[PDB]
């Protein structure tokens, strides 16, 4: 084709996690913060051009929950098989000392959509400045996810993205350091 727009939903038991998002050619347009009942546009500019009534998404998720109960029974309670993620760490631009950059942790090809992700700087957790995406759909119906860490490149710091998933026997650490 030329373009694809997808409204992707999921509901997961027993976690009771539900998600609602729109995708355009593999990028997220927006998702709904289900707790706050707010539309969260992926780029701030998007919300100046369009709107979405967040309230509406709750109804869909409620149906998906009811449908999950139905399908779970139909399958004779056949559970999901864990598929552990592939994890990659890259910067968004060529690295130069003391020039602000961003570390990207790409978590790909996994299910179920539950993960614990931690940025480590010199072996210690970082929370300042970090951000992340919700779980994004893949055409094979697994998931992917991005985490971000803005940083000042230096010879003194090393970084790791640590990923925990039920499909992994131990947490996966992907390293990055200057050079």
């Amino acid at each position: 084709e030329e373009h694809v727009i997808i409204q992707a939903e999921f509901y997961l038991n027993p976690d009771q996690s539900g998600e609602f998002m729109f995708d355009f050619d593999g990028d997220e347009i927006f998702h709904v913060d289900m707790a706050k009942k707010e539309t969260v546009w992926r780029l701030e500019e998007f919300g100046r051009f369009a709107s979405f009534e967040a309230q509406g998404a709750l109804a869909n998720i409620a149906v998906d929950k009811a449908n999950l109960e139905i399908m779970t029974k139909r399958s004779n309670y056949t559970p999901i098989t864990n598929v552990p993620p592939e994890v990659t760490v890259l910067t968004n631009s060529p690295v130069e000392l003391r020039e602000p950059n961003v570390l990207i942790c790409f978590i790909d090809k996994f299910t179920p959509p539950v993960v614990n992700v931690t940025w480590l700087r010199n072996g210690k957790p970082v929370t300042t400045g970090v951000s992340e995406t919700v779980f994004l759909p893949r055409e094979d119906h697994l998931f992917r996810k991005f985490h971000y860490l803005p940083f000042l490149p230096s010879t003194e710091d090393v970084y790791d993205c640590r990923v925990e998933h039920w499909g992994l026997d131990e947490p996966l650490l992907k390293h990055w350091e200057f050079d």
Binding site: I5, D64, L68
Partner: protein
Amino acid sequence: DTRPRFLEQVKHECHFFNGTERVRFLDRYFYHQEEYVRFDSDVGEYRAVTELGRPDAEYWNSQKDILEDERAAVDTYCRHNYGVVESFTVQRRVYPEVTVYPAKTQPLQHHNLLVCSVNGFYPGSIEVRWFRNGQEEKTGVVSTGLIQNGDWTFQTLVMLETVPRSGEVYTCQVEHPSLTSPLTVEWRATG
């Protein structure tokens, strides 16, 4: 936590060809990763994809209100939403930043790679070529492939496996929808 998990997914897909001239709508339901039932606008009724979806296909197809709601979706959902978002999605163009630098496969070697780093572009389709003295180099080219950054930008690194010589002019050339002519960056060993 070793408790079994159970997952339901729904994907309501709008596929566009030649703007909104041709549009296909899919209403897709999944248990874990298994699609079990689907409405395809090419057909106009639900079809079970697996045995798991048979009861739904049968019941939903018996409800004319459901069928007409789905049959109209190419217009009331797909074409409508395309109109709402096209200006900042379909029309989005962000030009790549291009950087060229030498590198080494192993740390104590003399330079034996040239890297063309192409960053920050949208949309994804891009063509990156290497030239040496105005002639395209096709041997020894390797790449990261297209990398999605997750934030409506892409990047790619395209390497040329060669040892730079003094006097040679290397050029990375980039073609992309945001550009009206190829973007070229030259690099010289004694530059």
